[PDB]
Amino acid sequence: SRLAVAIHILSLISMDEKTSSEIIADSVNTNPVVVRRMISLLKKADILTSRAGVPGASLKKDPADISLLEVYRAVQKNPKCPVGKKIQNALDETFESVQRAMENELASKSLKDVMN
Amino acid sequence: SRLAVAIHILSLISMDEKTSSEIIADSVNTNPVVVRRMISLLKKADILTSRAGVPGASLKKDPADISLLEVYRAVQKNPKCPVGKKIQNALDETFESVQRAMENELASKSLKDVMN
């Protein structure tokens, strides 16, 4: 999951130590292209602000105001018979109920919530 | 997801028409190895009983007594720094909260619930 990697990244950025992306990948023990990518997305989602002429970036807001769900989206990625299709629709909506559930927890926790 | 495929399969079996696995794959428009596999698992999970000398199989219980979660399980499949690991643990448990959530909806619906 990219969520986890996005979380480690954000955690370290929490400390706000002008930590470069490289160091983060090292510290996170992950490829630094992934890290930079994750970081462009997070910024694209305005979760992270950057201040060129300064390595890395930093939280646009406070960790207590950053939901995991909020993080998720930012890094978020037969049959033919008529009967089959029908059922398909049933299925389709259920997966939306479970989906909303998944999504509802992620909105319950905060970045701060994990950092402890 | 194998859950969906497992659901289509169970739905048709609902009708209990001595439907062979082949026909099911046809009807479901999926490979018949997958179907048979899914069907061995479902039986292994005693969701489906079989009566050799009869194509296909059938529900061991009533559709209203078959939770999707119940179906799910049957077909259910760095860092080095000390800080990283810590966070890992935080993450680990959260994913268990979301997980339980996912799992809690699947237990709310029934096979019958989708068949309508």
Interface test with A, best of B105, B108, B110 (most A CBs within 10 A): B105
- A53 near A102, Cβ under 8 Å? no
Tell whether omega for the bond before A82 is within 30 degrees of 0, i.e. cis.
no
- Residues A43, A84 contacting (CB under 8 angstroms): no
CA A67 to chain centre: 9
CA atoms within 13 A on the CB side of B82: 0
User: Structural domain of residue A71, as residue ranges?
Assistant: 1-116
Ordered DSSP codes for A8-64: HHHHHHHT-S---HHHHHHHHTS-HHHHHHHHHHHHHTTSEE--SSSSS-EESS-GG
Half-sphere exposure of A97 (CA within 13 A, CB side): 16
Residues of A in contact with B4 (CB under 8 A): 91, 95
Q: CA-to-CA distance for B17 and A95, rounded, in angstroms?
A: 28
Q: How far apart are CA A59 and CA A71, in angstroms?
A: 12
Nearest CA to A115 out of A64, A76, A79 is that of A64
Q: Pick the closest to residue B2 from B75, B68, B109, B67 (CA basis).
A: B75
Q: Residue written as tokens 């997980």?
A: B99
Is some CB atom of chain A closer than 8 A to the CB atom of B24?
Answer: no
By residue count, chain B amounts to 116
Which tokens go with A102?
């998944």
The rounded distance, in Å, linking the Cα atoms of A102 and B89 is: 19
Contact status, residue A45 vs residue A82, Cβ threshold 8 Å: no
Q: Give me the number of domains chain A comprises.
A: 1
Q: How far apart are CA A61 and CA A74, in angstroms?
A: 15
For residues B41 and B9, is the Cβ–Cβ distance under 8 A? no
Phi and psi for A67 in degrees, rounded to 5? -80, 150
Judging by beta carbons within 10 Å of its beta carbon (0-12, 13-18, 19+), is residue A72 exposed, middle or buried? buried
Cβ–Cβ gap B7/A87 under 8 Å: yes
Interatomic CA distance for residues A56 and A14, integer angstroms:
11
Q: Which helix (H) or strand (E) holds B23?
A: helix B21-28
- Rounded CA-CA distance A67/A110 in Å is 4
Give the CATH number of the domain where residue B58 resides: 1.10.10.10
Q: Could you tell me which chain A residue has the CA closest to the CA of B4?
A: A91
